[PDB]
Amino acid sequence: TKQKEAVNDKGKAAVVKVVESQAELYSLEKNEDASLRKLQADGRITEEQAKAYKEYNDKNGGANRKVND
Incomplete structure (x- = not known):
């Protein structure tokens, strides 16, 4: 261009x-690395690990109460 x-x-x-x-x-075919979202989406994670689903609630901020209504 110059x-x-x-x-x-x-x-x-x-x-x-x-x-x-x-x-x-x-990379997908080898599945070397996969995000959490996909994991559960593919159901790769076990029921025991599925307990982490509570992370969704924490993300929303429900666990953290707000001083103002």
Whole structure:
């Protein structure tokens, strides 16, 4: 964009990110790392670990009472 060359090109014809998206699927297939949300969504976590669901209530702030109504 600031230099001129025969080799240089816009590169708009081809998209590099195309391969990046496929990378996500690869990781997903291996399930190397998964968020909590997915875990329960997939039901990967056990019932014993499901007890953590109480974290939802804490997040809302219900556990933390407000001084003002």
